[PDB]
Amino acid sequence: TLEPRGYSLLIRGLIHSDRWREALLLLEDIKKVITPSKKNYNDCIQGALLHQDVNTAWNLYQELLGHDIVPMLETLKAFFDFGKDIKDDNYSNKLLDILSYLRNNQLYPGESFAHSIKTWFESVPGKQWKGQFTTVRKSGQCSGCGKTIESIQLSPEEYECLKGKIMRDVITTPQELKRFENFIKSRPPFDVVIDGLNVAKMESQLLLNVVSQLAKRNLRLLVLGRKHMLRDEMEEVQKQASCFFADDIDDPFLLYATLHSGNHCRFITRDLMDAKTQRLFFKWQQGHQLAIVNSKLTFQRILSYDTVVQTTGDSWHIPYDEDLVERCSCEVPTKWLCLHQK
Ligand SMILES: [Zn+2]
């Protein structure tokens, strides 16, 4: 089932004119048959902002979020662009809410969006915000203002908060889950938990390469596999590491094993996926996932600080993506917008 024919382009062609309200009527027609696209919402929001109807713009944005649509970054950028000319506490709080959206969903502005945010803070009368484009030192100190970036390390309470929350949503076969439970609880904490299956994707001898090289680093390795790997050098893997072979049916064993082992334990697998718990999960993932980067194997660096939109009230630090640099799934941005009040 599709939008009425040509409606997205009709909407896009109306929003700069005095007839822009007609686009919102077309959007209503779309809603009645399908969930509108993020581009549909982008267009109607920009139409509203172009004509200073901030309530309509924000209401459309909230509707979009209600459908669990991920807004285009261009839509978020539009709110800051129009905000430089808007002097109102209520509008400001909405913008700060968009920054919380980026923080909570582990998202980053593109370069021009970062410039729009900078421009908006610097436009707020009386507040004396100054923005600078920076990097972060190895130490975790912003190269602009010298403040220490939020630690990537979860506190014990945070960790047990996350762990407890994860343990209770988990609760495939229960008979097989009990077996794995008894396996883990009768063993010491591991240092790296390896999804042998999902790393055998880039069968046997590269699993061996990951294992045999990690074992030279004096690490306690757990390898998670399925039964079908037992049907040569798998036996070479079984001897170099502790192994659990599940049924060939996706397993929740990697999360359990890693979290049970403790806050020090890291893991290897495919890239992974309330607000506070979600924040902790992103932070934990960033600091604990070991990403393989491609013939002698090397891992992606894990920093001591959390690369995420963040604030201290009197400052913001906002990682952003550069136009000239394409970033992979598992790597964090290296460039930051540093905002501080004088
Ligand atoms: Zn700074």
Author numbering: 207 to 377, 386 to 416, 422 to 450, 458 to 475, 478 to 501, 510 to 530, 535 to 582
Manuscript excerpt for this entry:
Activity assays showed that MRPP3 lacking part of the N-terminal flexible region (Δ102-MRPP3; residues 103–583) was fully active, while removal of the N-terminal flexible region and of PPR motif 1–2 (Δ206-MRPP3; residues 207–583) gives raise to inactive enzyme. Only this inactive construct produced crystals that diffracted to high resolution, which therefore allowed crystal-structure determination. Δ206-MRPP3 is an L-shaped molecule composed of an N-terminal PPR domain, a central domain and a metallonuclease domain. The PPR domain is connected to the metallonuclease domain through the central domain (residues 334–356 and 545–583), which comprises a four-stranded, anti-parallel β-sheet (β1 and β8–10) and harbors the conserved zinc-binding site. A long loop region between β9 and β10 (hereafter referred to as the lariat loop; residues 560–575) intercalates between the metallonuclease and PPR domains. When comparing the structure of this region in Δ206-MRPP3 and the homologous PRORP1, it becomes clear that the Δ206-MRPP3 active site is distinctly different from that of PRORP1. In human Δ206-MRPP3, however, the equivalent residue to N492P is R498, which occupies the metal-binding site, and forms a salt bridge with D478. At the same time, D499 is flipped out of the active site to hydrogen bond with the S569 of the lariat loop. The first key difference between Δ206-MRPP3 and PRORP1 is that the individual domains are oriented differently. Δ206-MRPP3 adopts a relaxed, twisted, L-shaped conformation with the metallonuclease domain being moved out of the plane formed by the PPR and the central domains. We propose that MRPP3 is kept in a non-productive conformation by a dual-control mechanism, namely by the presence of a non-productive active site and by the orientation of the individual domains toward each other.
Transcription in human mitochondria gives rise to two long polycistronic transcripts that are subsequently processed into mature mRNAs, tRNAs and rRNAs by the mitochondrial RNA-processing machinery. According to the tRNA punctuation model, the tRNAs are processed first, and recent work indicates that the primary processing is performed co-transcriptionally through tRNA 5′-processing by mitochondrial RNase P (mt-RNase P). The third subunit, MRPP3 (also known as PRORP: proteinaceous RNase P), contains the sequence features of a zinc-binding domain and an N-terminal, putative RNA-binding pentatricopeptide repeat (PPR) domain, where the PPR repeats are helix-turn-helix motifs of ∼35 amino acids and are found in a large number of RNA binding eukaryotic proteins. Furthermore, the MRPP3 subunit harbors a C-terminal domain that carries the sequence features of a metallonuclease; MRPP3 has therefore been assumed to be the endonucleolytic subunit of mt-RNase P.
